[PDB]
Amino acid sequence: GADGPEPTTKNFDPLGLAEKGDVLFYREAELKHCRLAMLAVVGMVVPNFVRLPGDIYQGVSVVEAHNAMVEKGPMVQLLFWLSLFEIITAPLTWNMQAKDREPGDFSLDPLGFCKDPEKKKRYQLSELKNGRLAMLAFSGMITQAVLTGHGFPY
Amino acid sequence: DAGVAPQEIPLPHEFLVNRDLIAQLYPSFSKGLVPFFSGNWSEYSDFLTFKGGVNPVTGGLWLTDTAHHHLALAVLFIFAGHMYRTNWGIGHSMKEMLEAHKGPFTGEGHAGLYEILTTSWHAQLAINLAMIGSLSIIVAHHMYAMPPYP
Amino acid sequence: SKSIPFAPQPAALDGSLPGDVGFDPLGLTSIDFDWAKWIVPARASMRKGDEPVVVDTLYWMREAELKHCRVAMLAVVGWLAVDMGLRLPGTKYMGLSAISAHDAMVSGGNMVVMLHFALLLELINGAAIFAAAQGSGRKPGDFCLDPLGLAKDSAKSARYQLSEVKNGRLAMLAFSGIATQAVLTGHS
Amino acid sequence: VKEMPGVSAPLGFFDPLGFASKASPETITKYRESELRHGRTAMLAVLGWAFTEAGCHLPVFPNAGTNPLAAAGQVPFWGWAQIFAFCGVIEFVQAKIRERPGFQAGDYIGSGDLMDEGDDQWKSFQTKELNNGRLAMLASIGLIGQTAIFGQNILEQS
Amino acid sequence: ANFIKPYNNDPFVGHLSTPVTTSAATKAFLGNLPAYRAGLSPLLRGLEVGMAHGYLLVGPFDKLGPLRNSEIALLSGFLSAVGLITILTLCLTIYGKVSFQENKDLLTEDGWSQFTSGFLVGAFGGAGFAYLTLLNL
Amino acid sequence: ASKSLPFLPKPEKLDGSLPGDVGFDPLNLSATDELGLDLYWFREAEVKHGRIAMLAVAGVLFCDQIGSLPGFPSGKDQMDLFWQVFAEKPNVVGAGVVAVSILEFISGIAITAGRKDGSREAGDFNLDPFNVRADPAKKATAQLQEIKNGRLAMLASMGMIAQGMTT
Numbered sequence: 001g002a003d004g005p006e007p008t009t010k011n012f013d014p015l016g017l018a019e020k021g022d023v024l025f026y027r028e029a030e031l032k033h034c035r036l037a038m039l040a041v042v043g044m045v046v047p048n049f050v051r052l053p054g055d056i057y058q059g060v061s062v063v064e065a066h067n068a069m070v071e072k073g074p075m076v077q078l079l080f081w082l083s084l085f086e087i088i089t090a091p092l093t094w095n096m097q098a099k100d101r102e103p104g105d106f107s108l109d110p111l112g113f114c115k116d117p118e119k120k121k122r123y124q125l126s127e128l129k130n131g132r133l134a135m136l137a138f139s140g141m142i143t144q145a146v147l148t149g150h151g152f153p154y
Numbered sequence: 155d156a157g158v159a160p161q162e163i164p165l166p167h168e169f170l171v172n173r174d175l176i177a178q179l180y181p182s183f184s185k186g187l188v189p190f191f192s193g194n195w196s197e198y199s200d201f202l203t204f205k206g207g208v209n210p211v212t213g214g215l216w217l218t219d220t221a222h223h224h225l226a227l228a229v230l231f232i233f234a235g236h237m238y239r240t241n242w243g244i245g246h247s248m249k250e251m252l253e254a255h256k257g258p259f260t261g262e263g264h265a266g267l268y269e270i271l272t273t274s275w276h277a278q279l280a281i282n283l284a285m286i287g288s289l290s291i292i293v294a295h296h297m298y299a300m301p302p303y304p
Numbered sequence: 305s306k307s308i309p310f311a312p313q314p315a316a317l318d319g320s321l322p323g324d325v326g327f328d329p330l331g332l333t334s335i336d337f338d339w340a341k342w343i344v345p346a347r348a349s350m351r352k353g354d355e356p357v358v359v360d361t362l363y364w365m366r367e368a369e370l371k372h373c374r375v376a377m378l379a380v381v382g383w384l385a386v387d388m389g390l391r392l393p394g395t396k397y398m399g400l401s402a403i404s405a406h407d408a409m410v411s412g413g414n415m416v417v418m419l420h421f422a423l424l425l426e427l428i429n430g431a432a433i434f435a436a437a438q439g440s441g442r443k444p445g446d447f448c449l450d451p452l453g454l455a456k457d458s459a460k461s462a463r464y465q466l467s468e469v470k471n472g473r474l475a476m477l478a479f480s481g482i483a484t485q486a487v488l489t490g491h492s
Numbered sequence: 493v494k495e496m497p498g499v500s501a502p503l504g505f506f507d508p509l510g511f512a513s514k515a516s517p518e519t520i521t522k523y524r525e526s527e528l529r530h531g532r533t534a535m536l537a538v539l540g541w542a543f544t545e546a547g548c549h550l551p552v553f554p555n556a557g558t559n560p561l562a563a564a565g566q567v568p569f570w571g572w573a574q575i576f577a578f579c580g581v582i583e584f585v586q587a588k589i590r591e592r593p594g595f596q597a598g599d600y601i602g603s604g605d606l607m608d609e610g611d612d613q614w615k616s617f618q619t620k621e622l623n624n625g626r627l628a629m630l631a632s633i634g635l636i637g638q639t640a641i642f643g644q645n646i647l648e649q650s
Numbered sequence: 651a652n653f654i655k656p657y658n659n660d661p662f663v664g665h666l667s668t669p670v671t672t673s674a675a676t677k678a679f680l681g682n683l684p685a686y687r688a689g690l691s692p693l694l695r696g697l698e699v700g701m702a703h704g705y706l707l708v709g710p711f712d713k714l715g716p717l718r719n720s721e722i723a724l725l726s727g728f729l730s731a732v733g734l735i736t737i738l739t740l741c742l743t744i745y746g747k748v749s750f751q752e753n754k755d756l757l758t759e760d761g762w763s764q765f766t767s768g769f770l771v772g773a774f775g776g777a778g779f780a781y782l783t784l785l786n787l
Numbered sequence: 788a789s790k791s792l793p794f795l796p797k798p799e800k801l802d803g804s805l806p807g808d809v810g811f812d813p814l815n816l817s818a819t820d821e822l823g824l825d826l827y828w829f830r831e832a833e834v835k836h837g838r839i840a841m842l843a844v845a846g847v848l849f850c851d852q853i854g855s856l857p858g859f860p861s862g863k864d865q866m867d868l869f870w871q872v873f874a875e876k877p878n879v880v881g882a883g884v885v886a887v888s889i890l891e892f893i894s895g896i897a898i899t900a901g902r903k904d905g906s907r908e909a910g911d912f913n914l915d916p917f918n919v920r921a922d923p924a925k926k927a928t929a930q931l932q933e934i935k936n937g938r939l940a941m942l943a944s945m946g947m948i949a950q951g952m953t954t
């Protein structure tokens with residue numbers, strides 16, 4: 001899917017881990033990390049601009065938000081339902097090369113671009129790329145935010 | 155133990171007809187057998203104790219301790235008596251049990267011991283006599299250390 | 305592939321019973337255990353090594369689901385009725401909170417009586433479950449109690465059964481939520 | 493190699509990073525030797541950590557009986573020297589073993605020349621050893637880590 | 651499996667190939683002892699055995715002898731070890747002169763004589779070394 | 788096909804010959820052929836439990852409250868009454884107990900006899916004064932009404948025992 005674009009990295013597998021077989025699991029893991037990182041970057045930027053109505057949500061920086069919400073509960077109910085979705089998402093664990101479903105695929109395509117194969121390829125590539133950049137951005141955001149006093153620009 | 159002369163002690167059958175006559179000594183009979191079936195066995199701690207040690211007056215084991223002991227042993231023996239298969243499918247077949255236990259160091263394992271112990275009285279007598287003798291010695295050791303009688 | 309499109313429909317699960325949307329992401333029905341030894345153990349006196357052709361796992365789970373759902377429907381309606389104040393005659397049932405109802409009646413004694421009645425009824429139900437493994441045609445949850453007599457229609461009975469399953473699952477969720485919330489905060 | 497013991501598990505053959513994918517038989521044998529040495533050492537280390545934590549101390553170590561990392565200080569340098577000497581003597585014996593022609597990784601009992609025939613039960617039991625040893629490795633490193641970070645020490649809500 | 655099989659694949663010999671009797675551990679450990687190691691002159695075998703058994707023997711006499719509580723305990727222990735070593739070398743010489751009578755494998759008159767000379771020298775060395783070590787400790 | 792419970796089948800052993808039979812045997816205890824019970828023991832036990840339970844109900848009613856035969860004073864529900872009657876006249880209560888014991892021993896010999904041969908039917912002691920056995924219908928009706936109203940006796944006696952025994 002990645003297919004060899006861009007100057008710095010065309011076919012980046014120096015360690016050649018995928019050469020050990022079962023690349024579909026690695027692809028699904030990459031997609032999962034990408035989705036989490038994109039949502040995490042968005043939730044990193046937004047709280048500075050807007051905070052939820054509840055008083056306990058109000059106040060507290062993104063660096064301390066995790067602990068405060070774990071204490072309050074939101075970071076526990078979120079965990080509960082994420083665990084529901086992950087447990088229900090069993091197929092990926094034991095059947096990887098046997099299952100027909102492509103990695104990181106759920107039957108959610110209201111826009112319908114997945115119907116057209118070529119635009120589907122373009123969109124999968126764009127998703128992978130924006131997700132990789134989002135992973136890097138989230139990592140840098142966290143590190144700089146703890147290193148810096150404030151985390152809105154950082 | 156309270157010092158009542160044997161003449162004034164009511165006959166043992168008198169302790170089976172009037173419950174109150176026993177409730178004076180152990181005020182848990184008053185509740186009766188309802189705690190037993192309700193599961194509130196703790197209410198019987200008056201006469202089913204686990205204090206151990208020795209009775210200071212008579213110098214022997216507490217009778218309540220022995221009562222609880224024998225009750226627990228009765229429960230365990232009744233439970234263990236349902237282990238073996240006799241006429242209804244459920245149960246253990248000792249032949250299969252013995253045949254199953256075999257490791258690398260012992261070849262065929264306990265294969266053929268059931269036939270030995272069900273076709274020769276001398277084998278069974280050897281085991282039973284060894285166990286009875288060891289048990290008698292254990293009795294001798296335990297009775298002096300914890301005098302069971304007053 | 306239904307109600308969870310991105311997973312194969314469980315092969316053991318069959319889309320041929322009321323409320324069938326192929327929803328078993330954890331493959332619970334895929335367990336090969338026959339769930340009939342659980343009532344009549346192992347070889348047993350009353351067993352002929354019969355094939356797991358009926359009780360299997362889906363029959364057991366289905367009887368369990370139907371029992372849960374009907375019990376929960378009754379429980380939710382009764383809880384709502386009592387918290388509105390329907391304490392009934394007796395002068396001993398009155399003055400107790402629905403939260404206190406259980407332990408209060410357990411200390412009362414009627415709970416023991418209804419426990420013995422439930423023992424009798426569940427013994428009947430276990431005998432029924434043992435049937436259909438001895439060669440009966442009983443279906444999961446089928447006690448043959450049908451005054452409405454829609455089985456002759458062969459289509460309206462199916463709709464009623466599907467509606468039963470759905471209403472009962474909703475009732476189970478509703479009762480669980482009602483109990484938890486009411487424990488945390490008191491409301492009607 | 494996939495055939496050698498240890499494979500049986502929920503994960504099956506577990507080589508995400510390629511270490512035995514193209515390793516010569518010598519390197520795979522050395523990897524297995526290291527796995528078994530670490531596993532056995534870790535099993536003993538965890539058992540000793542449990543012994544020390546429960547207060548079970550030798551009569552000759554009376555004062556220190558609470559925290560293993562603390563107890564390590566009470567041992568004089570020559571005690572550790574004798575530990576090292578004993579381990580080196582055993583290592584010398586094992587090195588003398590490995591010179592024999594028919595040596596298999598970790599088979600210091602010479603199972604190949606002892607068993608009447610190679611068996612599946614023997615492979616399964618070797619796998620049992622390897623699994624309990626891997627768990628012991630992880631558990632021992634975790635014990636040392638959790639006791640270094642939080643000084644309260646195990647059995648003290650750690 | 652079956653870890654017990656007849657020794658040497660001969661069912662009719664009075665022995666068994668148990669893990670203790672025939673395992674890489676025991677074969678390698680015994681095959682490197684001086685009494686069985688390969689490529690050793692009998693004199694060297696005797697010297698190794700004597701060194702092992704002389705250092706080994708001073709301790710019991712030194713610590714449990716009648717003079718253990720005196721300030722000369724170590725010397726008395728050393729002397730007792732020396733006397734016992736002399737007795738054992740007498741035993742070895744007579745055994746050699748009786749057994750092998752009608753340089754090589756250790757089972758010969760000259761081989762055993764060299765082994766005994768080596769054993770005496772090594773045993774006195776071991777006793778002396780134990781004394782030296784214990785003298786300051 | 789059981790008349791009582793359509794969902795579980797009627798037992799093969801129960802043919803309806805015995806009175807009060809509605810095919811209500813879920814656990815299929817009538818099929819027992821081990822430990823010597825075999826549905827003739829169960830029938831005899833049912834009749835005996837039921838008869839003595841009917842007597843128990845009639846006794847606990849205590850409507851006359853003259854203590855049955857004259858000289859028996861006072862009215863009490865169950866346990867205190869039993870002990871008090873035993874206390875005031877041990878001679879009479881012991882006499883009744885031994886009468887019951889004698890009939891019980893003879894009955895046990897009769898149970899074994901009925902097991903060996905079918906001469907003795909279940910619940911049969913030849914105590915019929917009417918001596919009505921020529922035509923089945925009346926005998927069957929009387930027997931099954933006995934069993935039904937005695938089952939009611941047993942349930943009523945449980946309704947009695949339950950009171951005062953709980954927490």
Ligand code: CLA
Nearest residue numbers: 203204205206207215219220222223226227296297300302
């Ligand atoms: C739990 C109730 C209980 C009580 C109060 C007693 C009380 C007594 N026992 Mg008994 N005993 C019991 C249970 C009990 N025993 C059981 C279950 C066993 C079976 C092993 C024994 C075996 C036993 C022996 C062999 C002896 C006694 C002796 C004694 C006396 C010694 C004094 C003392 O303090 O005893 C304290 C008693 C103990 C500390 C023993 C406790 C044993 C525990 C409960 C074992 C539990 C095993 C467990 C249930 C296994 C289940 C496995 C299964 C599920 C597969 C005293 C009267 C001695 C005696 O009377 O000599 C004159 C004696 O020699 N006991």
Ligand SMILES: CC1=C(/C=C/C(C)=C/C=C/C(C)=C/C=C/C=C(C)/C=C/C=C(C)/C=C/C2=C(C)CCCC2(C)C)C(C)(C)CCC1
Nearest residue numbers: 578701702703704705706771772774775776777778779780
């Ligand atoms: C570990 C152990 C063991 C064992 C041990 C042992 C057995 C030991 C031994 C030891 C020994 C046995 C030692 C020895 C040593 C010796 C030495 C160290 C020697 C030296 C020598 C010398 C030094 C000499 C010198 C000389 C000579 C030769 C002569 C004269 C001159 C001179 C002096 C020069 C076991 C496992 C069982 C158990 C646990 C513990």
